Structure formats: C-alpha cells, structure tokens
A paper describes a structure:
In the frame of this study, we solve the structure of E. coli EfpL (EfpL) and uncover its role in translation of XP(P)X-containing proteins: Through ribosome profiling, we explore the EfpL arrest motif spectrum and uncover additional sequences beyond the typical polyproline motifs that both EF-P and EfpL can resolve. The EfpL structure reveals a significantly tilted KOW domain relative to the C-terminal di-domain compared to EF-P structures, certainly enabled by the flexible hinge region between the independent moieties. However, a separate alignment of KOW and OB di-domains between E. coli EfpL and for example, the EF-P structure resolved within the E. coli ribosome from Huter et al., reveals low r.m.s.d. values. This suggests the relative domain arrangement is merely a consequence of the unique crystal packing. The structural alignment ultimately revealed a β3Ωβ4 loop elongation by two amino acids for EfpL, different from the canonical seven amino acids in EF-P. In this way, EfpL_R33 remains apical similar to canonical EF-Ps. As shown by the lowest-energy model, the local geometry in principle would allow the unmodified arginine of the EfpL β3Ωβ4 loop to reestablish the interaction with the tRNA trinucleotide. Furthermore, the model suggests EfpL could mediate specific interactions with the RNA as—unlike EF-P_K34—EfpL_R33 was found to stack between the two C-bases and make polar interactions with the phosphate-sugar backbone. Hence, based on the docking model we suggest that the prolonged β3Ωβ4 loop and its central tip R33 are capable of compensating for the lack of a modified lysine. A literature search revealed that E. coli EfpL is acylated at four different lysines (K23, K40, K51, and K57) in the KOW domain.
In bacteria, EF-P plays an important role in overcoming such polyproline sequence-induced ribosome stalling. Additionally, numerous bacteria possess an EF-P paralog called EfpL (also known as YeiP) of unknown function. Here, we functionally and structurally characterize EfpL from Escherichia coli and demonstrate its role in the translational stress response. Bioinformatic analyses based on AlphaFold predictions indicate that EF-P-like proteins have a three-domain structure similar to EF-P, but they only share about 30% sequence similarity.
Residue numbers in the entry: 1 to 144, 150 to 188
Write the structure that this text describes.
C-alpha cells in the first residue's frame, strides 16, 4: 500500500483507469498558515502519450505497478511505428510516435547503448534512455565569454551551446536536464 510521499520519477501508477508514468514531482510547501505540503505530479499516460497532472496529500494511498526492464536495440521505423528488439530473446516491442515522442528528441536514427523498455506482465509501457547522448549539430550560427547560442541537433531538438561550436560537430547532452556537457 504505497503512499504519495514515497512516489518517485520513473514509477508507474494505476490511477483512475490509467497507467501513468511519473515524469516529475514538485513538493509544494504550504500555500497558507495551517495548510499541508502537497505533491504535484506530472505524468505521461503510457497508452496515449498524453500528459496528466495530479496533486496529492502526503499520506494519500496510491497503487504502483511492478516494473520489469529489458535492454533493447532500435530495429526500424515504419511511419508512425517504432520497432525495438530485446537484445536477449529477440522479442519485438512496437511503440507509436505518441508514446515515445519525448525520447525521440534524443534518440539518433541508429539508436544508442543502454536503452531499456518498461513492461508490466507482458504489457509494453515506456522507453527508458540512458543519462547522456552524443548528437550532431545540424544548424547553428558560424562558430566564432560564458555565453551560449541556440543549436538544432539531428533529431530536431534545439539546445544552448557555447559560441565557438560549428555545424557538423558532435556534442554530449544530458538528456534529463537538456544541457550541453561538451564535445
């Protein structure tokens, strides 16, 4: 019987007929004298990819599902469908663009190491990426301080990078924080 104050980013809740992946938790301090601390959670509906927000009291009872992770390789894209394959038993995992939209801003067209899938008793839930990714800059102002400029990466993602960077350079990105880490 888990409570809301014990929930962390990465868990999946069974809440009001939906399976919700926890994306963010904001511990909000009391709004007024006598009020309680509240837990504002941001979720992603694993079936539709739609965002859901809910606020809970610390002791509210929730239901977390048991998760199973499996290492995967990106197999191929077919329009809206994205096929991955289990590196061990070669089981295919098909996601729609909606379900992995935010992960697609970081995943290069050849996939990447340390990629996992979240499952619950045979049901495919989400794609879990590693901490960092190396992506090539396609569009940026000519490389010429402590000041950053915008850069469009191969996946379409726009990020802030140092002035001297030029198009075609491969850069390291912290996925969770969307920050440049170096070449």
């Amino acid at each position: 019987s888990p409570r809301a104050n014990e929930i962390k980013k990465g868990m999946v809740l069974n809440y009001n007929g939906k399976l919700l992946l926890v994306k963010d938790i904001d511990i909000q301090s009391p709004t007024a004298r006598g009020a309680a601390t509240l837990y504002k959670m941001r979720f992603s509906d694993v079936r539709t990819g739609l965002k859901v927000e809910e606020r809970f009291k610390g002791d509210d009872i929730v239901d977390t599902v048991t998760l199973t992770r499996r290492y995967v390789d990106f197999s191929y894209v077919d329009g809206n469908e994205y096929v991955f394959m289990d590196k061990e038993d070669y089981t295919p995992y098909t996601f729609t663009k909606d379900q992995i939209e935010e992960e697609l801003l970081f995943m290069p067209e050849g996939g990447m190491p340390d990629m996992q899938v979240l499952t619950w008793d045979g049901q495919l839930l989400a794609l879990e990426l590693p901490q960092t990714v190396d992506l090539e800059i396609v569009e940026t102002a000519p490389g010429i301080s402590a000041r950053n400029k915008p850069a469009t990466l191969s996946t379409g993602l726009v990020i802030q990078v140092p002035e001297y960077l030029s198009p075609g350079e491969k850069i390291r990105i912290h996925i969770e924080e969307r920050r440049y880490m170096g070449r």
